[PDB]
Amino acid sequence: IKLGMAKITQVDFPPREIVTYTKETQTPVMA
Amino acid sequence: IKLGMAKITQVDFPPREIVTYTKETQTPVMA
Amino acid sequence: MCDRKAVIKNADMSEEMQQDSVECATQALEKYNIEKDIAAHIKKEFDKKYNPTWHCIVGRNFGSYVTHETKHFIYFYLGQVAILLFKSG
Amino acid sequence: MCDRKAVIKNADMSEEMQQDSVECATQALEKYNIEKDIAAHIKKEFDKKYNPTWHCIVGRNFGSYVTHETKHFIYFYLGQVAILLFKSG
Amino acid sequence: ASTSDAVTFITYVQSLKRKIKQFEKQVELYRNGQRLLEKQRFQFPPSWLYIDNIEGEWGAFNDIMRRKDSAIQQQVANLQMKIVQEDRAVESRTTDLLTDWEKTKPVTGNLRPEEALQALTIYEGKFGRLKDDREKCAKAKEALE
Amino acid sequence: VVDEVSNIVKEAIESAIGGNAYQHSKVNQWTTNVVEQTLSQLTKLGKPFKYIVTCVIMQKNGAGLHTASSCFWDSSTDGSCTVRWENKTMYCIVSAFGLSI
Amino acid sequence: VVDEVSNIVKEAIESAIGGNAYQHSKVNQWTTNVVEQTLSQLTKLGKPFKYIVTCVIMQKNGAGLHTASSCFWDSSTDGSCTVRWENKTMYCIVSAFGLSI
What is the annotated localization of this protein (chains A, B)? Predict the structure, then answer.
């Protein structure tokens, strides 16, 4: 069977990453 | 040609194990 | 009055989420006379509102440094308790 | 230095992760007395040995309810400061 | 994954971190100043945070910027690979377009000067855009690791 | 027909899963049911095609799936039908195929 | 051959994806390269069959996976091969179904 040229239908589902939005603030003890 | 019901490769992926609950904790108290 | 409020020091969250977290912490602290029981009530409120599982760290002395996700993070003081609660997932 | 003896009265976490975190906490307490730095080091060690993400908090007068994953919420106190490495997820 | 945009963001993040070194040095000096104020009782009014409150907000912003820089450093290799592939494909397409326009400029009888000039300019723009895109992707990868 | 194959796949998904979520003990069963429904839809048409129906179900846990179906089939006689149907917490990218017999 | 097809699919998955750092813009390219390599290996085999290849590539993020294909052919002269391959934190599964013309 002489099959013709065929491509591939690409459908990549999306992932979700991790947000490294660190809230930096030094925490002191009671004074 | 002839065709009918048959079998296939049965592959399934079990998921990871984790436990989530509202468990209360506390730090020790000193003076 | 036991006010678990905050000022603009480090508060990176949705406004409704931060207000709900502060109100839930204050209500749990008012309802429960123990710190652990107040933590349990606040965690129940968090798992009911923002779904399971969410935790809040609040106390006189504390410290937090983790992957604080956007619109669900906090690092401040709520009254005598240091409100450092960040939700990621 | 500092008596960084982690006595886990309640250890609902992995033994290997808890031991690695305890060793890192002892090293960090020998390095410095900053409880926030010790908690950050414990959280970083737990997140490195058990993937993202892990959160650890060290304080004196605080009450928090751990909303974490199974076998990853280690509450080991080096004395009285309960360094609860409740890896949320 | 888009190499040009990723490299531009990486170079911008590198410049931002170079400035943020001095910005955070000033932030540490200001945290010390706010602490000294609170020692003199000059903690900031509770409408916003104190001097340490502005310091905590700046620390949150710096944590976000450091997270962006860490993501850039993690994905720099993939961004560079995507940019190199896109630049090579665009340059091959620009070569094909330049050759095709030079071979078959629109040289018909009426308005054929404008049509042939447009075809030649389209081929030249394709080649130059491919070259510029490749150069920009490489420069952004260099500026963003 | 690719449009008919996609419509049959969508109807089978609506009839079997529809708004059903993802369960570990039932994902493979749902995939088998969807594949069987697609195979029955392809066989009942009477077209002389060696129909192949593939069903893959993923969980919406931050995982993306790249779905494709390329086969050594004739361009003017055969083809493949790989589509994706999305749910709230059940990702299902399923493919139907047909080769001239 | 089922074993030969599984070995070729494993070699293609190793050559395409491997166990390197994950990338959404590169996972689809790896899946496409694996599909092209599998198609080339099937075409160079020379056996009288019309293979149908479905490559399922996923990332390890707690999502369940069930890559299955229900078809309509003859098991005496046609068959399919299943190979379990993956990465350090990603999956590389190809479902190849060789069908006699």
Answer: Cytoplasm, Cytoskeleton; Cytoplasm
Alpha helices in chain F (DSSP H): 2-16, 27-44
Residues 38..77 of E with a Cβ closer than 8 Å to C: which?
Answer: 44, 46-50, 52-53, 56-57, 59-60, 63-64, 67
Q: With contact defined as beta carbons under 8 Å apart, do G80 and G98 qualify?
A: yes
> Which of B18, B21, B27 comes nearest D59 by C-beta?
B27
According to the entry, how was the structure determined?
cryo-EM
Mutate to test the interface with G, among B11, B12, B16, B18 (most CBs of G within 10 A): B11
Whether residue A19 contacts residue C67, with contact meaning beta carbons closer than 8 Å, is answered with yes
Which chains does chain B touch, 3 or more C-beta pairs < 8 A?
C, D, F, G
Contacts of E124-131 with CB under 8 Å at 24 or more apart are: E124/E98, E126/E93, E126/E94, E126/E97, E126/E98, E126/E101, E127/E91, E127/E94, E127/E95, E127/E97, E127/E98, E128/E94, E129/E90, E129/E94, E130/E87, E130/E90, E130/E91, E130/E92, E130/E93, E130/E94, E130/E95, E131/E91, E131/E94
Looking at the complex, report in whole angstroms how far the Cα of residue B5 sits from the nearest Cα belonging to chain F: 9
CA atoms within 13 A on the CB side of E140: 28
Q: Are G99 and F50 within 8 A, CB to CB?
A: yes
Residues of D with CB under 8 A from a CB of C: 35-36, 39-40, 43, 47, 52-55, 57-68, 86, 88-89
Instruction: Calculate the CA dihedral of residues E52, E56, E57, E61 and round it to 10 degrees.
Output: 140
Between the alpha carbon of residue B25 and those of residues C81, D84, E142, F69, F97, the distances in Å are 15, 9, 49, 52, 56
Q: Rounded distance, CA G21 to CA G16, Å?
A: 13
Which residues lie across from G71 on neighbouring strands? F52
The structure tokens listed for E22 are 């001095």
Q: Mutating which of E53, E58, E67, E70 best tests the C interface, going by the most C Cβ atoms within 10 A?
A: E53
Which two structure tokens, joined as six digits, stand for E21? 């070194």
Domain assignments of chain C as residue spans, ordered by start: 5-89
Closest CA to D58 of D31, D30, D29: D29
Please state whether beta strands F79-85 and F90-98 pair in parallel, antiparallel, or not at all (unpaired): antiparallel
Question: Which class would CATH give D5-89?
Answer: alpha beta
List, as one string, the DSSP characters of E77-129. Answer: HHHHHHHHHHHHHHHHHHHHHHHHHHHS----SSSHHHHHHHHHHHHHHHHHH
Residue C28 half-sphere exposure toward CB, CA atoms < 13 A? 29
PDB resolution in Å: 6.2
- 3-class DSSP state of G83: coil
